[PDB]
Amino acid sequence: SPEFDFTPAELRRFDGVQDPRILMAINGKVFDVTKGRKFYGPEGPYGVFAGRDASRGLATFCLDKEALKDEYDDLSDLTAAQQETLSDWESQFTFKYHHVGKLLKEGEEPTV
Amino acid sequence: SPEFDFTPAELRRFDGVQDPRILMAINGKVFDVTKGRKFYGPEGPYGVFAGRDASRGLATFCLDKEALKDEYDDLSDLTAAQQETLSDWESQFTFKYHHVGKLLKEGEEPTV
Ligand code: HEM
Ligand code: HEM
């Protein structure tokens, strides 16, 4: 929590459609990617990640919507390589976008 | 069959490892992608497609290995958009690589 922590269910409405803001989680961190609407908007190539935990899709290079989990995604089955890929993506989003807070894991308590 | 048609089981060994040749199917067409070993070899980024029907992975933009089907993949559940993507990929492989023959669908008889 630099600002506010979210559960996955709480993140869903921030998809650029139900709310003009687009939030997206990568490796436990929620980013404000509203300025990247060309990517994450409803007509964007990566719109499947809007309001979602994008970790598994980014880590495995998979845009298939049916591959996204609805609630909590335990990433413990990712390979070493997929985990390294996920970390690379996290670094890029950290550089480019505002970090809003944590995506809470199941049972994890909020901060601030 | 410009040369030879394959079932998915017959295609498997052409992965650059069990055989130096790498064959790959896209939208029912088998291509010789041996010259693209930098992509499809065992250390390549797209090695998951070597000796496989790559149609679903290319169409849905998904490199996740567990998403590949082992035998015949009925593509009838792809979306209109995924089908258009698959066609785009087919055009590119047609331009770049040698077309060997058909990937036989289940029950489909060989030609020549
Ligand atoms: C042939 C396949 C792909 C190609 C050639 C490609 C190419 C690109 C290019 C050129 C950019 C930069 C866009 C720009 O700055 O205008 C980009 C950004 C990006 N790509 Fe792709 N991509 C592909 C597939 C994928 C897949 C499968 C994923 C995720 C599962 C993905 C996720 C992303 C993300 C998250 C960005 C960052 C956009 C941002 O700056 O926030 N891409 N890609
Ligand atoms: C951020 C994600 C991605 C980026 C930036 C990206 C970028 C690229 C680039 C730059 C090339 C040309 C390589 C060269 O000519 O040296 C390429 C080729 C290719 N990409 Fe990706 N890619 C991404 C993800 C994917 C995914 C998810 C798939 C498939 C599911 C994919 C499939 C392919 C294929 C089949 C080629 C053709 C190689 C050939 O010429 O046979 N890519 N990509």
Residue numbers in the entry:
A (entry chain A), B (entry chain A): 68 to 179
Paper lines:
We solved the crystal structure of the haem-bound PGRMC1 cytosolic domain (a.a.72–195) at 1.95 Å resolution. In the presence of haem, PGRMC1 forms a dimeric structure largely through hydrophobic interactions between the haem moieties of two monomers (a stereo-structural image is shown in Supplementary Fig 4). While the overall fold of PGRMC1 is similar to that of canonical cytochrome b5, their haem irons are coordinated differently. In cytochrome b5, the haem iron is six-coordinated by two axial histidine residues. These histidines are missing in PGRMC1, and the haem iron is five-coordinated by Tyr113 (Y113) alone. A homologous helix that holds haem in cytochrome b5 is longer, shifts away from haem, and does not form a coordinate bond in PGRMC1. Consequently, the five-coordinated haem of PGRMC1 has an open surface that allows its dimerization through hydrophobic haem–haem stacking. Our structural data revealed that Tyr164 and a few other residues such as Tyr107 and Lys163 are in fact hydrogen-bonded to haem propionates. In the PGRMC1 crystal, two different types of crystal contacts (chain A–A″ and A–B) were observed in addition to the haem-mediated dimer (chain A–A′). It should be noted that a disulfide bond between two Cys129 residues is observed in the crystal of PGRMC1, while Cys129 is not conserved among the MAPR family proteins. Since PGRMC1 dimerization involves the open surface of haem on the opposite side of the axial Tyr113, no space for CO binding is available in the dimeric structure.
